[PDB]
Symmetry: D2
Subunit: 115 residues, 4 copies
């Protein structure tokens, strides 16, 4: 699988477990088509979203349901969700890890792209 998402909780210093997310691919009509989805594991990671065959070049959006995560912890958050929008490019062999580091009023996201 060429795409993995990892989510961390900066308040508790822990993986962010059971965080739902949806992945979309931009269609020719410039609308977001559902592509894959899941929830993070006990390690904060979501594996197996796609395959090398299906993950062709294009524009993808990962929508991470951060608001429901904070609400389940009784913490009022700022964002509705965290959005990660990027172009997958074929250049050479490539694997994508999208990391998201969550706080109630702040998040960071990083792409680690390796061969």
């Amino acid at each position: 699988c060429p795409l993995m998402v990892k989510v961390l909780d900066a308040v508790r210093g822990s993986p962010a477990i059971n965080v739902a997310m949806h992945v979309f691919r931009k269609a020719a009509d410039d609308t977001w088509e559902p592509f894959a989805s899941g929830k993070t594991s006990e390690s904060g990671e979501l594996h197996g979203l796609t395959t090398e065959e299906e993950f062709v070049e294009g524009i993808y959006k990962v929508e991470i349901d951060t608001k429901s995560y904070w609400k389940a912890l009784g913490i009022s958050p700022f964002h509705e969700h965290a959005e990660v929008v990027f172009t997958a490019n074929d250049s050479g062999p490539r694997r994508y890890t999208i990391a998201a580091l969550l706080s109630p009023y702040s998040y960071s996201t990083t792409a680690v792209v390796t061969n």
Copy 2:
């Protein structure tokens, strides 16, 4: 003005100047209606996007055009843009400062909300 956006460049250690952004508000039909737009100044700030009267309760999206920013500096970055989606004013009028800290393969965004 109750909404201000500030953008910093973590590669240069500078304000991120001339960064375009578009603000949208979710309409009754669940579509994103264009609300305001502008570009950051020499201080990396964008002021005057809206007024207290116009900035009603709702769900807002700030789309920060980070890819164009990096490309003009010779850098091919990971993200298409940075999106900041949030409910505003649902406990009454507040002032919102949205900060974004940019690197080619990573960004963070923070909200400072004052009454």
Copy 3:
């Protein structure tokens, strides 16, 4: 004043108020000499730590007392403090803004350096 520190609280979405910090300068004998200290204001900023005359070339350390900040809010955080160590003015006088974004188990620090 050529050195200012700004601290934000990523749990509350607020300036981090009353955050103590101590600034040191590396002496000729490689020890850290106390240089300046203070606490952030209601805006989360600490101004007036030094003057252009006193802020000579050197290696400086800003020790931000984050643990005391979190403990007063009922939180037991991971870090003892946030340290920011940098060479200043080695290409001539500059203005330095050090920003720190705080969460209980994570923080970021950014420098904005202007001429």
Copy 4:
């Protein structure tokens, strides 16, 4: 091993490879005693720094040589090094992952503490 350090490069979107770091433990005389050191692997990780037996409660400092990393890439950085200072606490079974996300003028560090 109860302590692992992982370093990412936010400019290139890659593990930060061959990053040197030194770990210190605070001694009773309040000085920093060398404890362990190493360089990150091709995965940006440094494993095997210590053992459960040796990693007793106390105050530890991880000093990450970020300046040499950026200098090897021809990029002028702001910080002399990144410092992570924390208390190891025995509470229950615990493993510590210290993550550092590096940009030339900014870094973030996060602790992921798991059982």
